[PDB]
Design an enzyme around this catalytic site. Sequence first.
Site, PDB file in Angstrom:
ATOM      1  N   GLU A  11       0.861  -1.169   0.000  1.00 52.63           N
ATOM      2  CA  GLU A  11       0.000   0.000   0.000  1.00 52.63           C
ATOM      3  C   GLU A  11       0.902   1.225   0.000  1.00 52.63           C
ATOM      4  O   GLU A  11       1.705   1.373   0.910  1.00 52.63           O
ATOM      5  CB  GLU A  11      -0.928  -0.088   1.200  1.00 52.63           C
ATOM      6  CG  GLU A  11      -2.026   0.945   1.140  1.00 52.63           C
ATOM      7  CD  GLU A  11      -3.353   0.574   1.772  1.00 52.63           C
ATOM      8  OE1 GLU A  11      -3.514  -0.605   2.172  1.00 52.63           O
ATOM      9  OE2 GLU A  11      -4.228   1.476   1.849  1.00 52.63           O
ATOM     10  N   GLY A  12       0.798   2.037  -1.063  1.00 49.99           N
ATOM     11  CA  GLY A  12       1.451   3.339  -1.143  1.00 49.99           C
ATOM     12  C   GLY A  12       0.493   4.451  -0.738  1.00 49.99           C
ATOM     13  O   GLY A  12      -0.684   4.196  -0.398  1.00 49.99           O
ATOM     14  N   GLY A  15      -2.303   4.355  -3.395  1.00 48.42           N
ATOM     15  CA  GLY A  15      -3.240   3.256  -3.562  1.00 48.42           C
ATOM     16  C   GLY A  15      -2.686   1.882  -3.206  1.00 48.42           C
ATOM     17  O   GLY A  15      -1.491   1.724  -2.933  1.00 48.42           O
ATOM     18  N   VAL A  17      -1.668  -2.022  -3.870  1.00 46.35           N
ATOM     19  CA  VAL A  17      -0.989  -2.781  -4.923  1.00 46.35           C
ATOM     20  C   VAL A  17      -1.293  -4.262  -4.742  1.00 46.35           C
ATOM     21  O   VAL A  17      -1.148  -4.786  -3.655  1.00 46.35           O
ATOM     22  CB  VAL A  17       0.530  -2.510  -4.952  1.00 46.35           C
ATOM     23  CG1 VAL A  17       1.201  -3.066  -6.195  1.00 46.35           C
ATOM     24  CG2 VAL A  17       0.836  -1.005  -4.909  1.00 46.35           C
ATOM     25  N   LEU A  74       8.218  -7.637  -9.203  1.00 50.08           N
ATOM     26  CA  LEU A  74       9.418  -8.248  -8.629  1.00 50.08           C
ATOM     27  C   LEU A  74       9.093  -8.991  -7.337  1.00 50.08           C
ATOM     28  O   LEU A  74       8.139  -8.674  -6.683  1.00 50.08           O
ATOM     29  CB  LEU A  74      10.488  -7.220  -8.391  1.00 50.08           C
ATOM     30  CG  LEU A  74      11.181  -6.746  -9.665  1.00 50.08           C
ATOM     31  CD1 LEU A  74      10.444  -5.546 -10.229  1.00 50.08           C
ATOM     32  CD2 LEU A  74      12.662  -6.471  -9.420  1.00 50.08           C
ATOM     33  N   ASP A  77      11.200  -6.982  -1.696  1.00 47.44           N
ATOM     34  CA  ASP A  77      11.774  -5.670  -1.510  1.00 47.44           C
ATOM     35  C   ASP A  77      12.983  -5.734  -0.579  1.00 47.44           C
ATOM     36  O   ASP A  77      13.267  -6.738   0.077  1.00 47.44           O
ATOM     37  CB  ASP A  77      10.686  -4.702  -1.040  1.00 47.44           C
ATOM     38  CG  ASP A  77      10.157  -4.856   0.381  1.00 47.44           C
ATOM     39  OD1 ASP A  77      10.930  -5.241   1.284  1.00 47.44           O
ATOM     40  OD2 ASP A  77       8.984  -4.505   0.627  1.00 47.44           O
ATOM     41  N   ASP A 118      10.405  10.124  -2.499  1.00 52.13           N
ATOM     42  CA  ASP A 118      10.015   9.291  -1.380  1.00 52.13           C
ATOM     43  C   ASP A 118      10.682   7.909  -1.407  1.00 52.13           C
ATOM     44  O   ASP A 118      10.018   6.871  -1.194  1.00 52.13           O
ATOM     45  CB  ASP A 118       8.503   9.179  -1.255  1.00 52.13           C
ATOM     46  CG  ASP A 118       8.103   8.533   0.059  1.00 52.13           C
ATOM     47  OD1 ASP A 118       8.801   8.773   1.122  1.00 52.13           O
ATOM     48  OD2 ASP A 118       7.053   7.843   0.046  1.00 52.13           O
ATOM     49  N   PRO A 121      13.210   1.672   1.729  1.00 51.58           N
ATOM     50  CA  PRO A 121      13.492   0.284   1.368  1.00 51.58           C
ATOM     51  C   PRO A 121      12.341  -0.487   0.710  1.00 51.58           C
ATOM     52  O   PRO A 121      12.608  -1.323  -0.163  1.00 51.58           O
ATOM     53  CB  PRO A 121      13.855  -0.283   2.732  1.00 51.58           C
ATOM     54  CG  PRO A 121      14.580   0.859   3.439  1.00 51.58           C
ATOM     55  CD  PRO A 121      13.653   2.005   3.106  1.00 51.58           C
ATOM     56  N   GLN A 122      11.103  -0.132   1.078  1.00 49.33           N
ATOM     57  CA  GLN A 122       9.916  -0.779   0.462  1.00 49.33           C
ATOM     58  C   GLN A 122       9.706  -0.444  -1.028  1.00 49.33           C
ATOM     59  O   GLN A 122       8.966  -1.162  -1.718  1.00 49.33           O
ATOM     60  CB  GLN A 122       8.670  -0.537   1.303  1.00 49.33           C
ATOM     61  CG  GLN A 122       8.865  -0.984   2.749  1.00 49.33           C
ATOM     62  CD  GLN A 122       9.148   0.248   3.609  1.00 49.33           C
ATOM     63  OE1 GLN A 122      10.225   0.929   3.598  1.00 49.33           O
ATOM     64  NE2 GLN A 122       8.105   0.639   4.323  1.00 49.33           N
TER      65      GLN A 122
HETATM   66  C1  XKU Z   1       5.709   0.529  -1.507  1.00 46.01           C
HETATM   67  C2  XKU Z   1       5.183   1.248  -2.725  1.00 46.01           C
HETATM   68  C3  XKU Z   1       4.796   2.653  -2.366  1.00 46.01           C
HETATM   69  O1  XKU Z   1       6.239   1.256  -3.713  1.00 46.01           O
HETATM   70  C4  XKU Z   1       3.941   0.574  -3.346  1.00 46.01           C
HETATM   71  N1  XKU Z   1       4.237  -0.782  -3.783  1.00 46.01           N
HETATM   72  C5  XKU Z   1       4.627  -1.175  -4.974  1.00 46.01           C
HETATM   73  C6  XKU Z   1       4.927  -2.515  -4.932  1.00 46.01           C
HETATM   74  C7  XKU Z   1       5.416  -3.534  -5.925  1.00 46.01           C
HETATM   75  N2  XKU Z   1       5.691  -4.720  -5.356  1.00 46.01           N
HETATM   76  C8  XKU Z   1       6.157  -5.675  -6.150  1.00 46.01           C
HETATM   77  N3  XKU Z   1       6.405  -6.888  -5.552  1.00 46.01           N
HETATM   78  C9  XKU Z   1       6.300  -7.103  -4.106  1.00 46.01           C
HETATM   79  C10 XKU Z   1       7.488  -6.456  -3.415  1.00 46.01           C
HETATM   80  C11 XKU Z   1       7.424  -6.729  -1.918  1.00 46.01           C
HETATM   81  N4  XKU Z   1       7.397  -8.193  -1.689  1.00 46.01           N
HETATM   82  S1  XKU Z   1       7.783  -8.703  -0.198  1.00 46.01           S
HETATM   83  O2  XKU Z   1       9.075  -8.158   0.139  1.00 46.01           O
HETATM   84  O3  XKU Z   1       7.643 -10.142  -0.217  1.00 46.01           O
HETATM   85  C12 XKU Z   1       6.542  -8.100   0.916  1.00 46.01           C
HETATM   86  C13 XKU Z   1       6.656  -6.808   1.579  1.00 46.01           C
HETATM   87  C14 XKU Z   1       6.656  -8.034   2.398  1.00 46.01           C
HETATM   88  C15 XKU Z   1       6.199  -8.812  -2.281  1.00 46.01           C
HETATM   89  C16 XKU Z   1       6.256  -8.576  -3.770  1.00 46.01           C
HETATM   90  N5  XKU Z   1       6.389  -5.563  -7.472  1.00 46.01           N
HETATM   91  C17 XKU Z   1       6.108  -4.389  -8.022  1.00 46.01           C
HETATM   92  C18 XKU Z   1       5.628  -3.307  -7.297  1.00 46.01           C
HETATM   93  C19 XKU Z   1       5.400  -2.036  -8.031  1.00 46.01           C
HETATM   94  F1  XKU Z   1       5.711  -2.144  -9.318  1.00 46.01           F
HETATM   95  F2  XKU Z   1       4.106  -1.627  -7.959  1.00 46.01           F
HETATM   96  F3  XKU Z   1       6.185  -1.064  -7.529  1.00 46.01           F
HETATM   97  C20 XKU Z   1       4.636  -2.844  -3.590  1.00 46.01           C
HETATM   98  N6  XKU Z   1       4.188  -1.802  -2.909  1.00 46.01           N
END
Ligand code: XKU
EC number: 2.7.11.22
Length: 279
Positions: A11-12, A15, A17, A74, A77, A118, A121-122
């Site tokens: 969640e960003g 919105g 995800v 991906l 994170d 912004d 690490p996430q």
């Molecule tokens: C934070 C934000 C604000 O960037 C919005 N946000 C974007 C994403 C995103 N996430 C992924 N893949 C996920 C990455 C984290 N892992 S994890 O480590 O297992 C989990 C956290 C425990 C699960 C898979 N792939 C693409 C995107 C995008 F392309 F959308 F960026 C996730 N949150």
Amino acid sequence: ENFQKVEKIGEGTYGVVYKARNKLTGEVVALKKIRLVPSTAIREISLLKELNHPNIVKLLDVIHTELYLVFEFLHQDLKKFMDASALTGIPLPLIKSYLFQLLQGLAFCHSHRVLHRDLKPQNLLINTEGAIKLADFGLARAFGVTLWYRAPEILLGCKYYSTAVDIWSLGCIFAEMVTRRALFPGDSEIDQLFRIFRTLGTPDEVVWPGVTSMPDYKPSFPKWARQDFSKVVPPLDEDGRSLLSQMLHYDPNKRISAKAALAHPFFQDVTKPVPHLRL
Ligand SMILES: CC(C)(O)Cn1cc(-c2nc(NC3CCN(S(=O)(=O)C4CC4)CC3)ncc2C(F)(F)F)cn1
């Protein structure tokens, strides 16, 4: 209709995800459903579809029907990876590889006058091939809270901040990879600024010309002395400490650029290791 949601992955600010599959093609993607569309956002987001680089998460499609953003997926994170690596630490050659790749991503985006604003690490996503990629570049400007990675100029109320804010954030992340603890974990804006000041010293007109004229600057701020820098990221070597020092300069104009950081002697021996990921 066009995507099967698999699971919630984030969640960003803008919105929720989901991991999702395209029902026609079978492509696995990250699908972001944008919360509550202004025409300037549509035009700005459409320009980010063009901003393609191996260390930037690809925006595959913008769907304004009856706003959804479809991104490359991906599997992990950097926060989860750092937490998995906490007993031993991320090996320095992998930290160096990740920092190098993220500076390449920033240098590309900054060369196109696109800021992240912004980084955290996430927002930094990794794969099994040793790649790391930046997620969310340009969304803050297109659409219009962790404070730990916020540049001091933002916290002091600067309206018209620069590419330097992303170098600050990345320096904070660098330090956190090395030490296995957040550098400046503030829980409010003032606590964040005071944590910065307690480590790097309260800034003044000598180190940051113009600081005392910034919107939220107060003469009443406590005056802390700057800490010995070898106390900040032990046991990082002098090349790493030198580069970090330059990424965490107060004066955004003094702060090292991504492009200049890539030439720093710290990257003399850079390689591309592969992380063992547990998926
Ligand atoms: C934070 C934000 C604000 O960037 C919005 N946000 C974007 C994403 C995103 N996430 C992924 N893949 C996920 C990455 C984290 N892992 S994890 O480590 O297992 C989990 C956290 C425990 C699960 C898979 N792939 C693409 C995107 C995008 F392309 F959308 F960026 C996730 N949150």
